[PDB]
Amino acid sequence: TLRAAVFDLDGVLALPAVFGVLGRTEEALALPRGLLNDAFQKGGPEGATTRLMKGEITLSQWIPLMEENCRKCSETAKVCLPKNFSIKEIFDKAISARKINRPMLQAALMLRKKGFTTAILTNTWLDDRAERDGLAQLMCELKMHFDFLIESCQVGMVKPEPQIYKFLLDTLKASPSEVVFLDDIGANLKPARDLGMVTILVQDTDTALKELEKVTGIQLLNTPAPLPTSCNPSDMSHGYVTVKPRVRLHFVELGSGPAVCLCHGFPESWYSWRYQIPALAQAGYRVLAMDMKGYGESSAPPEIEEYCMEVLCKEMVTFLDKLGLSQAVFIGHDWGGMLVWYMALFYPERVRAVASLNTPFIPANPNMSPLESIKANPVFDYQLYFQEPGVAEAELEQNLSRTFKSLFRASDESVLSMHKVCEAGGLFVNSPEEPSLSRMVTEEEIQFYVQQFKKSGFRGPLNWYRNMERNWKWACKSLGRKILIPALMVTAEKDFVLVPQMSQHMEDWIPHLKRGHIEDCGHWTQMDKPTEVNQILIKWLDSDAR
Amino acid sequence: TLRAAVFDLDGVLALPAVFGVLGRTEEALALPRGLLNDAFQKGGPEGATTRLMKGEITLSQWIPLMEENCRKCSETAKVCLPKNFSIKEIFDKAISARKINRPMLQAALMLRKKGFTTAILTNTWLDDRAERDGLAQLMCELKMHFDFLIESCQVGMVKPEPQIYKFLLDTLKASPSEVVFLDDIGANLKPARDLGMVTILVQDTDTALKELEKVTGIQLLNTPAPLPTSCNPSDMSHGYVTVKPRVRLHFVELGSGPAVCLCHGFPESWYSWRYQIPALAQAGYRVLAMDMKGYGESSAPPEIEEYCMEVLCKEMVTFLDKLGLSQAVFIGHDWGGMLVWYMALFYPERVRAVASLNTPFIPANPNMSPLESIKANPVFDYQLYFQEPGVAEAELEQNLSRTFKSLFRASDESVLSMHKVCEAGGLFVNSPEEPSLSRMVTEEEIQFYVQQFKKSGFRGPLNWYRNMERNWKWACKSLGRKILIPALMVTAEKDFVLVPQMSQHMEDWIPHLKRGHIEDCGHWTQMDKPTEVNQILIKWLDSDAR
C-alpha cells in the first residue's frame, strides 16, 4: 500500500534543529523562556518569518526584522537583551552546527532501494549570508539521495498550509494513503493526517525509525552497514581532452577542491572507482576518474608502443596542461598503480601526492631483462600469455559477460588460478560458460563493463603488458632517484598476484612512504572493500595532500 | 631564411635568473666572491649539478650535495658559512622570485604568429620540493605558447653538450642556418654557432630584442599592445552534463580554484569568452564557459517554454548539482546577464558572486505587461520582430556568414540600426550580402560560429525572447527581495541597446553593487575590449569572490 516517503529536513534528516537554538540561546543567556520563539513567530501568517519561508524576502533581509521582534518581545516582557546579543551570530552558529542525521538518511535510502519514491519537504529560506556555502553543501549532499526536494521558499507555500500538501501529492503522483510523512512539528503533520497520510512525529530518531519500519514492513533499524554511494553513469559530468591528433582521453568529474586523478587497472574503466568518486568529492576534492588510454570512451590506437609507460605518462601530463592543472594527486590501481609511481618519478612537479592500491613500486633491475624477471615468478605467467598479439584478445573478447564475471570475483569466490596459464592454453580454460555473479557486482554493473568493451575490445588494454623492454629501458634512467613527494602504498591481503610482501622494500626508494593495509581483500580492491579504501584515501588525502 | 626561434628559460624568458641568486647571496652575506658558483659547478661534467640537470637525481637529493660542496669550497678558501645558511632557503626564494619576462614572451609570440616554429631549450631539474607547484605553474603558463619544450632533465642531455643541439635540430626539423637561438650564457651559444645557427647573447632584454628584430626582419620592439591569449577549440577540455532526459549542457573547462561559470548572450557561444577563458584560469580560477541551452553542443529542444528564465535557472542549478559544485561565481553577458541576475535572486546559496556585462538588473513592473514595457523603448523593437515563430529564424539562418558578419561589429563599423526592424521587414533589410569583416574577428572565427549554428539554428536561441509573460510573472515573486551577495555591473559606453543609463537605479535593489565601465565599447564587450574586460573581472574576482 505505502509507495512514498516524505521527510522534513530540520529535526528529521538534519540535527540539531534550528528552532532548538532558540530554546538553547534563551537557556544559555538566562532569557525569559520562549522569548526568542515569540519573536521568531511574531505576526504569524503575515509576520517576517512567514514571508522569509515563502521566498518573499531573503535571510539577510529577515535578520533585522527578527532583531526588531526580539526588542519588542523584551520590552513587552519588561527585560533587556544582553550586550552583544546577535541574531546573525546565533543563526550562523546554529546553521553550521546542523549535520546530516545519518540513520534517518540511511532509512530513506533503504526505502528508495525497495522502490519507494522519496522526498524532502521543508520550510526553508533563501540564504544570502556570507557563510551560505555551508548550507548549500548540506543541501547538495542530502538532495542527491531523493526523488524530489520541495522547498517552501521556492514554491511560495509553507507547512502547515493545506496547498503545499496538495502540491506534494501532485509532485509524488500518489494518493495520500500511499504516503508516510515524517516531521518533528505536530502542527505540520495534522494536514497530512487530515488527508489520510500515515504520519510519524519524530522526537528521537530510533523510535521514529521503529514506527517507520512497522508501518512500511521494511527493516530499517539494525540493518547491515550499507555500501558507500555509487555513481550513475548518465548522471555524471563527462569530460574529453585531445592530448594529440589520434588520442582523446575521457574522464568523469565530480567535486571541487584539489584535483585528484584516479587511474584504473586492467581490464577496467573509470567506473571501477564508482564507490570512491562521490566519497572523495564529498570529502573536499575535485575527482577526475579516467578511462585510461585503450579503454571505454578514450581513444584506443592499435600500435603496441602507443602504450609504453613513457608515452602514457607524457600524455597524462598533456591532459593536465590542456585542463590548465599545474598538478593533481595521482591515485592508481594495478596498471594505473604502476603508472602513478612513474609519474611521481618523472614528473614530480606535476604530482601533488601519489598513491597506489596493490601495485608496489619496483625499480627496474638493470642486470636482468624484464622478461626473465617476469618468468621468475609463477604468478605472473598470465603476463606471458598476454604477450603474443591476438591470442589473449580472442579469448577475452569471445564472450564479454563471461570474461568480466570470471575476473571480477572476491577472494572467497575465485574461478581462475593465475597459474600455468600458457601451459593450460588460456585464462578461462577451466572456468564455467556462465559463471555465477560475484557478491561484489550486480548484473547491471557487469553489463556496463561489457558495453564499454564492445567499443574497442582488448587490444589497447593488452598492449599495456607488451612494452616490458621499452618500459625497462625508460625506468633504468630513474635508478638514481628517490620518491620524496607525499606517497601512500595500500596493500591487499589476498591479492595473490600483487602480494603485500612484494611491496616490502619500497622504503628504500620512498623513505617517507605511508601505508594502509586491507584485510580479506582480493585484487579488485575498490569494489571488494570500498568503505575501507574510502577511509584510508580520505584520511591520507587530508593529512598529506591538503 | 630563418624559420625557427629557440629561447632559454633562465635569464631569457624568465627573470631574475637563478645563477643570479648565487651572485646576490654572496654579496648580501659578504661571502668570498664566486664561492657559491664554485660549489654549484664543482666536479663539472660529473659533479652533482650536472647529474641534476640530466635527470639522474631530483632537486631534493641535490640540495645536500650542493651543501657539501659549499662546506668544501669554504674550508678550501679558509672562511666560514654564516649560522642559518640554507641552500634550500636560497633556492626556494630564487625560484619564486623568477617571473615571466613579458617582452621576451611577446616577441616569441609575434614570431610564432608570423609562422616561426618556436621552442624553449633549457637546463633544468626534476623538482620535488614542497613548494614545486610554483615552478609547475610558471612552466604551464610559458609552454602553451611554444611548439616544443625541451628540458635537459627529461632528455638526459645538457647545454653545452653538442648532442642536445643535434636533438634540438631534429625536433625542429630545420637546418642550423634556419634557426636563431637566444641564451644568457655564452658558453651555451658556442655549439649553436659552430653549427651555423644565428645566436644572440641576452644581457638586457631590449638589446637582445633589437638584434632579434634585425636578424628576423620582423618588428618585435615597440609593437602595439597584443590581444589576450585566445582559445583553440580543439585544445580545450569539453564537458557534457545531462540535466534532464532531453537536455544535456556542453561547456569548456580550464584552470583550478573557485568555479566561475561564464554565460554568453544571443546569438553567441562558449567561444565568445575565448579571450577571458585563459586569463581567468591564469588568475587562479576554474572557468566553466557554457554553451547555453539552445546553442552549440548543448541540447536545443523546440518548445518555447523550455527557454523561460525559471526553467533555465533550475537547469543551471542541476548542472552545479551533477558536477558536485555547491556554488559558482556567475558572470553573464546580454541574455546570459539577465540569467545571472535571476540566479542571484532565486538561488543566492548557489551563487558565490554575480557579475553582468551590459545587461542591467531591472525588476519586473507589476503594473505593466512586459510587451508594453518593451514597446515603450524604440531600441527594443528588434525583440518584437523576434516574437513570431519562424520569421526571425528564416532571416538569420538564410546565410550564416552574413548573419554573424553583420552582427559582430565594433561601434565605429555598424551596419544595422536596431530601429524600426518590424516596419522595415527584417534585421538585415539594409545591410550588404557580403559584409566586410569586423576588426574584432577573423574569417576563421566567423566560420566557427557558422559551424556551431548549423547544428541547431536559431529556434532555441530566439525562444529566449519568447517568454516575456512567463518571465514577468516569475520575476514578480522576487519583488520584495534585494541582491545582497557580491555583485558587479559592467556598462559599455556604446552599446546602443543595453545603454549604461539603463543600469542607473540598480543600487536600489543591489545596495553594495560594484561597477566598471568600458569606454568606446559596443554591444560585443568580450571581443570588443577583451583586455579591459579581463582586468575589470580579475580585479573584482580577487577582491569579492576569493
Ligand SMILES: Cc1cc(-c2csc(N)n2)c(C)n1C[C@H]1CCCO1
Ligand atoms: C608490480 C609489477 C612488477 C612488474 C614487473 C616486474 S619486472 C617487469 N618488467 N615488470 C610489473 C609490470 N608490475 C605491474 C603490475 C601491475 C599490473 C601489471 O603488473
Ligand SMILES: Cc1cc(-c2csc(N)n2)c(C)n1C[C@H]1CCCO1
Ligand atoms: C535588459 C532587459 C530588459 C528587458 C525587459 C524589459 S521589460 C521585459 N519584459 N524585458 C529584457 C528582456 N532585458 C534583457 C536584455 C538582455 C538580452 C535580452 O534583453
Ligand SMILES: [Mg+2]
Ligand atoms: Mg521541522
Ligand SMILES: [Mg+2]
Ligand atoms: Mg640561462
